Write an enzyme that holds these catalytic residues in place. Structure first.
Site, PDB file in Angstrom:
ATOM      1  N   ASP A 161       0.809  -1.219   0.000  1.00 36.10           N
ATOM      2  CA  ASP A 161       0.000   0.000   0.000  1.00 36.10           C
ATOM      3  C   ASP A 161       0.844   1.273   0.000  1.00 36.10           C
ATOM      4  O   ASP A 161       1.368   1.691   1.042  1.00 36.10           O
ATOM      5  CB  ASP A 161      -0.937  -0.003   1.218  1.00 36.10           C
ATOM      6  CG  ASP A 161      -1.829   1.231   1.282  1.00 36.10           C
ATOM      7  OD1 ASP A 161      -2.140   1.814   0.224  1.00 36.10           O
ATOM      8  OD2 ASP A 161      -2.222   1.619   2.401  1.00 36.10           O
ATOM      9  N   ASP A 198      -1.612   5.558  -5.379  1.00 42.31           N
ATOM     10  CA  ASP A 198      -2.042   4.712  -4.267  1.00 42.31           C
ATOM     11  C   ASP A 198      -2.340   3.274  -4.714  1.00 42.31           C
ATOM     12  O   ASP A 198      -3.442   2.978  -5.156  1.00 42.31           O
ATOM     13  CB  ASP A 198      -3.298   5.333  -3.630  1.00 42.31           C
ATOM     14  CG  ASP A 198      -3.746   4.607  -2.379  1.00 42.31           C
ATOM     15  OD1 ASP A 198      -3.122   3.588  -2.020  1.00 42.31           O
ATOM     16  OD2 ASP A 198      -4.730   5.062  -1.752  1.00 42.31           O
TER      17      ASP A 198
HETATM   18  C1  LIG Z   1     -13.424   4.041  -3.510  1.00 43.19           C
HETATM   19  O1  LIG Z   1     -12.750   4.129  -2.232  1.00 43.19           O
HETATM   20  C2  LIG Z   1     -13.023   3.020  -1.348  1.00 43.19           C
HETATM   21  C3  LIG Z   1     -11.721   2.218  -1.206  1.00 43.19           C
HETATM   22  C4  LIG Z   1     -11.432   1.152  -2.096  1.00 43.19           C
HETATM   23  C5  LIG Z   1     -10.236   0.403  -1.979  1.00 43.19           C
HETATM   24  C6  LIG Z   1      -9.319   0.741  -0.943  1.00 43.19           C
HETATM   25  C7  LIG Z   1      -9.593   1.804  -0.051  1.00 43.19           C
HETATM   26  C8  LIG Z   1     -10.797   2.542  -0.184  1.00 43.19           C
HETATM   27  C9  LIG Z   1      -8.592   2.136   1.031  1.00 43.19           C
HETATM   28  O2  LIG Z   1      -9.001   2.758   2.004  1.00 43.19           O
HETATM   29  N1  LIG Z   1      -7.287   1.756   0.931  1.00 43.19           N
HETATM   30  C10 LIG Z   1      -6.229   1.934   1.932  1.00 43.19           C
HETATM   31  C11 LIG Z   1      -5.242   3.023   1.438  1.00 43.19           C
HETATM   32  O3  LIG Z   1      -4.251   3.285   2.440  1.00 43.19           O
HETATM   33  C12 LIG Z   1      -5.964   4.373   1.194  1.00 43.19           C
HETATM   34  N2  LIG Z   1      -5.005   5.470   0.954  1.00 43.19           N
HETATM   35  C13 LIG Z   1      -5.607   6.788   1.210  1.00 43.19           C
HETATM   36  C14 LIG Z   1      -5.993   7.150   2.650  1.00 43.19           C
HETATM   37  C15 LIG Z   1      -7.324   7.514   2.979  1.00 43.19           C
HETATM   38  C16 LIG Z   1      -7.657   7.843   4.311  1.00 43.19           C
HETATM   39  C17 LIG Z   1      -6.661   7.805   5.314  1.00 43.19           C
HETATM   40  C18 LIG Z   1      -5.326   7.441   5.004  1.00 43.19           C
HETATM   41  C19 LIG Z   1      -4.221   7.393   6.076  1.00 43.19           C
HETATM   42  C20 LIG Z   1      -4.140   5.983   6.722  1.00 43.19           C
HETATM   43  C21 LIG Z   1      -2.826   7.911   5.628  1.00 43.19           C
HETATM   44  C22 LIG Z   1      -5.005   7.113   3.660  1.00 43.19           C
HETATM   45  C23 LIG Z   1      -4.939   7.938   0.428  1.00 43.19           C
HETATM   46  C24 LIG Z   1      -6.351   7.460   0.030  1.00 43.19           C
HETATM   47  C25 LIG Z   1      -5.518   0.554   2.161  1.00 43.19           C
HETATM   48  C26 LIG Z   1      -6.538  -0.567   2.430  1.00 43.19           C
HETATM   49  C27 LIG Z   1      -7.150  -0.695   3.704  1.00 43.19           C
HETATM   50  C28 LIG Z   1      -8.092  -1.722   3.932  1.00 43.19           C
HETATM   51  C29 LIG Z   1      -8.429  -2.627   2.904  1.00 43.19           C
HETATM   52  C30 LIG Z   1      -7.821  -2.510   1.628  1.00 43.19           C
HETATM   53  C31 LIG Z   1      -6.876  -1.476   1.397  1.00 43.19           C
HETATM   54  O4  LIG Z   1      -8.178  -3.424   0.638  1.00 43.19           O
HETATM   55  C32 LIG Z   1      -7.470  -3.627  -0.598  1.00 43.19           C
HETATM   56  C33 LIG Z   1      -8.451  -3.904  -1.763  1.00 43.19           C
HETATM   57  C34 LIG Z   1      -9.542  -2.822  -1.962  1.00 43.19           C
HETATM   58  C35 LIG Z   1      -8.986  -1.626  -2.775  1.00 43.19           C
HETATM   59  N3  LIG Z   1     -10.028  -0.605  -2.873  1.00 43.19           N
END
Ligand SMILES: COCc1cc2cc(c1)C(=O)N[C@H]([C@H](O)CNC1(c3cccc(C(C)C)c3)CC1)Cc1cccc(c1)OCCCCN2
EC number: 3.4.23.46
Length: 377
Positions: free
Chosen positions: A35, A220
């Site tokens: 990630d 990301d």
């Molecule tokens: C359409 O949006 C919904 C969505 C879909 C997806 C992931 C996230 C959110 C997800 O949450 N992604 C975060 C990453 O770390 C996210 N990175 C960001 C983020 C967003 C909020 C807070 C933080 C902090 C922890 C730095 C970081 C920059 C965007 C990592 C993650 C956490 C939990 C389960 C995951 C992936 O599953 C992997 C497969 C699914 C991929 N799709």
């Protein structure tokens, strides 16, 4: 010695790419989500319905309790746990062992995914966005401090279930074709970049380029979709609707809810436009573009119905937190996270996405005036 790291990533479609790691002494094996959109290294450390295995601190003689709590809220999911350190290795990575910060996850909500086959997460971004604060050294920083591994890694994410390579400490030239094009890392927290122009089937969206980066643009691997700020999302959907107007879709399709299907092999790829994202380059008034094919933003989903047709989900989503170039964007590109030189490189991947008459590309140089005005403050 990068060949040892080629093809060291696996995953289920839409469920994330993971790499194998070991933690503790003796080594406990876990699959860890890769990630670049976060900065905490965390692993399941207690039983969970969706975990087949987890980290057992009591079984490791090298474990140290930091006697501090931690939680991390992602976009939808979150976990909390206890901070500690332990020895960590990457079997199909460099031949080193590092003492790293590890968050032992004891509780979580909508974090672990049923069937994903990973039990932890490796946040590869910078300390600035680490929890509880930037004093918690991220894994890759520890790796680079404690070993001779160079301060960069590269990701080749290959579509579909899925596979890819994370080359730790370098670039593997057998994984891409053509030239690498580099865009500055604007600020070291997320891997933040600046988008300076957007085209759809060659037509400029003609928005104030600040809109593209409101309030940031990041790369990301931990997020699936291309996510675009509200105004940009609407303009993009309008243009993509216009281009595909010959066919009709549910409006819940454009919202990412309803999947659309066609008779297996009759998907009208040609009526969906290519999207070109222009990124700020390395020299004055210079940029380059990456072009995304519809095969990247129309993500294949297993048809729940008895029919074995081709069904897809629209993988471009509206965002309120800036542009996210997610895994579907990175797929078919070789992406170099060159932390040492504060830049991110893009090249056409060896495992590039296939279209009949079109090809994903990284092209340059382009001239773009006033690129510094594109950054949002
Ligand atoms: C359409 O949006 C919904 C969505 C879909 C997806 C992931 C996230 C959110 C997800 O949450 N992604 C975060 C990453 O770390 C996210 N990175 C960001 C983020 C967003 C909020 C807070 C933080 C902090 C922890 C730095 C970081 C920059 C965007 C990592 C993650 C956490 C939990 C389960 C995951 C992936 O599953 C992997 C497969 C699914 C991929 N799709």
């Amino acid at each position: 010695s990068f060949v040892e790291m080629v093809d060291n990533l696996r995953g289920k479609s839409g469920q994330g790419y993971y790499v194998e790691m070991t933690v503790g002494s003796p080594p406990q094996t876990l699959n860890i989500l890769v990630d670049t959109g976060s900065s905490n290294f965390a692993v399941g450390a207690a039983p969970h319905p969706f975990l087949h295995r987890y980290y057992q601190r009591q079984l490791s003689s090298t474990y140290r309790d930091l006697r501090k709590g931690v939680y991390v809220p992602y976009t939808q999911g979150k976990w909390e746990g206890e901070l500690g350190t332990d020895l960590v290795s990457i079997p199909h990575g460099p031949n080193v062992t590092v003492r790293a910060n590890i968050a032992a996850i004891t509780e979580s909500d909508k974090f672990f995914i049923n069937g994903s086959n990973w039990e932890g997460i490796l946040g590869l971004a910078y300390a600035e966005i680490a929890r509880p604060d930037d004093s918690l050294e991220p894994f890759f920083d520890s790796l680079v401090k404690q070993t001779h591994v160079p301060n960069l890694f590269s990701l080749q994410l290959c579509g579909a279930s899925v596979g890819g390579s994370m080359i730790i400490g370098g670039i593997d030239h057998s994984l891409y074709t053509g030239s690498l094009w580099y865009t500055p890392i604007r600020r070291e927290w997320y891997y933040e970049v600046i988008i300076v122009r957007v085209e759809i089937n060659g037509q400029d969206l003609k928005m104030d380029c600040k809109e593209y980066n409101y309030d940031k643009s990041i790369v990301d691997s931990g997020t699936t979709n291309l996510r675009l700020p509200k105004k940009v999302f609407e303009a993009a959907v309008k243009s993509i609707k216009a281009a595909s107007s010959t066919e009709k879709f549910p409006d819940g399709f454009w919202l990412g809810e309803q999947l659309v299907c066609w008779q297996a092999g009759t998907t009208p790829w040609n009526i969906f436009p290519v999207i070109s994202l222009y990124l700020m380059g390395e020299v004055t008034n210079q940029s380059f573009r990456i072009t995304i094919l519809p095969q990247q933003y129309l993500r294949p989903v297993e048809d729940v119905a008895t029919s074995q047709d081709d069904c897809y989900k629209f993988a471009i989503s509206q965002s309120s937190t800036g542009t996210v170039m997610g895994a579907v964007i990175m797929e078919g590109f070789y992406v170099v996270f060159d932390r040492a030189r504060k830049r991110i490189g893009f090249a056409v991947s060896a495992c590039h996405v296939h279209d009949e008459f079109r090809t994903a590309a990284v092209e340059g140089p382009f001239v773009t005036l006033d690129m510094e005005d594109c950054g949002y403050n």
